[PDB]
Design a protein around this ligand. Structure first.
Ligand SMILES: Cc1ncc(COP(=O)(O)O)c(CN[C@@H]2CONC2=O)c1O
Ligand SMILES: Cc1ncc(COP(=O)(O)O)c(CN[C@@H]2CONC2=O)c1O
Lengths: 269, 269
């Protein structure tokens, strides 16, 4: 079941722009012991997404309350929030559109994630390259066809996640996670000003790494560059962090970064 | 009202992937005298879009019938068809998803289009550049946030449509139309293998131009290149063709291409 604009609903108006153009944003949070993990970060990112999408909402307080209630009910699992421009406007126009739609739901915590953690992640390079567009880069908006295509190709391999490059060849992220790789004491993560999703866990990890003795760098790196790393790690709000056994057939030996982030990534806000 | 999977419905399951990721495609056709103009082309393009999106549908005959019925009812106006992967799948995965959803609706023919025809189109260069992705290029898929963003910027100007470049600087199309420009006897239109939507009217016009004495060329052209044209024309299924008075402040004097296409574009299938 879903909570739409304050009430239980299983259906949504067909005219809603999320449906027509995926005109909106979303977030996916971890629910533990009846609490939304990293709640304020999730709210904050939805606000940045709505801002960049020019979607004006004054329901943030109600949305937070709603997220906490569903979370308390679910206790453990996944909490998804979707915000769209709503209905209206002629064609692609946002004029006369609104008010924004808010959709909340929770599901139990996935099963495959735990096993994936106790066996390591295997990455496969994706043939689908992300188009570059600074106007949409970073935002967890609803146009995720690229991710659906990346995922479909990924299933054609034995890898658990994909290594996704952008149209210029720059390593950007995974299908549904962000990526970090380490070279000695330098930890690298792709700059997401041109493509990819600036995840909640990525931001959390960057804050950790920044303050840590690890030197964190946001780069524009080629596949070969990233593939000469001692260790590789991927993350998202639900994992929250996973060690990468290998990308393609390039094996990674270390897991110290992973061992450093893992414990810290399951005790946040 | 909408016709979803064979029946009148005003709402759609929230779980539908069109809503979650804009995971689908659509088409917008002109309805005249109770007939869907260029019907077979519209069906054919929906099939190519579903094919490229790996959305398997066996409802083409029913969808066509449905389109003709709604069209006969509406008599004159716009007929929109949306096809999505439906519901299902874990995350972005298409595995175990389906069956596909089909959504049909018709609305009266817009008012502004006619005036726009009897006054000329003014184009404004768009600051939003289309990301490039051959896996999605050409398809009229549901990820149209780029178009929503292009449109919002366009409204900040006095132009009727936008001139849209891709991330490499190549002229690609308009916000909701394709573009052709003429230089003497050579008619140019951007190649859409990297971005943009391969429209039904563009394909119709290319078939006309090909067989005509006009030399038609699909190119990769810079803004400056396109802006040194004698005439500029834009098209979509509903216009169906419009003369461009000027792009920015670069005026166009001729309208012979337009006069040649206009009459022929309102008598097709
Ligand atoms: C393409 C993409 N990149 C990165 C991320 C990571 O961001 P968070 O750290 O904020 O989660 C996600 C989110 N994926 C959620 C997490 O799991 N499934 C999702 O759709 C994503 O879809
Ligand atoms: C971005 C974009 N480019 C080109 C086209 C043209 O294709 P057709 O010739 O098949 O229509 C459209 C369609 N726009 C329809 C037509 O009007 N509004 C739409 O959304 C479009 O949205």
């Amino acid at each position: 079941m879903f909570l739409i604009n304050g009430h239980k609903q299983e259906s949504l108006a067909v005219s809603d722009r999320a449906t027509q153009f995926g005109d909106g944003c979303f977030t996916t949070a971890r629910v533990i012991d009846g609490k939304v993990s990293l709640l304020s970060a999730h709210i904050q990112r939805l606000q940045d997404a709505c801002q960049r999408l020019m979607i004006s909402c004054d329901f943030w307080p109600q949305l937070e309350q709603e997220m906490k209630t569903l979370a308390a009910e679910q206790q453990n699992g996944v909490l998804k929030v979707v915000i769209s421009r709503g209905s209206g406007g002629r064609g692609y126009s946002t004029l006369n559109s609104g008010p924004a739609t808010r959709i909340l739901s929770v599901t139990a915590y996935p099963a495959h994630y735990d096993r994936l953690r106790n066996e390591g992640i295997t990455l496969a390079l994706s043939p689908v390259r992300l188009g570059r567009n600074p106007h949409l880069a970073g935002i967890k908006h609803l146009n995720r066809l690229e991710q659906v295509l990346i995922r479909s190709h990924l299933e054609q391999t034995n890898a658990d996640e994909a290594l996704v490059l952008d149209s210029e060849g720059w390593v950007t992220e995974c299908c549904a996670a962000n990526l970090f790789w380490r070279k000695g004491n330098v930890v690298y993560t792709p700059r997401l000003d041109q493509a990819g999703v600036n995840g909640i866990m990525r931001q959390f990890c960057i804050r950790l790494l920044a303050q840590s003795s690890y030197q964190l760098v946001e780069v524009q790196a080629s596949l070969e560059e990233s593939l000469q790393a001692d260790e590789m790690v991927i993350c998202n709000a639900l994992m929250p962090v996973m060690p990468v056994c290998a990308c393609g057939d390039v094996s990674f030996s270390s897991a110290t970064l992973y061992e450093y982030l893992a414990p810290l990534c399951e005790r946040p806000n």
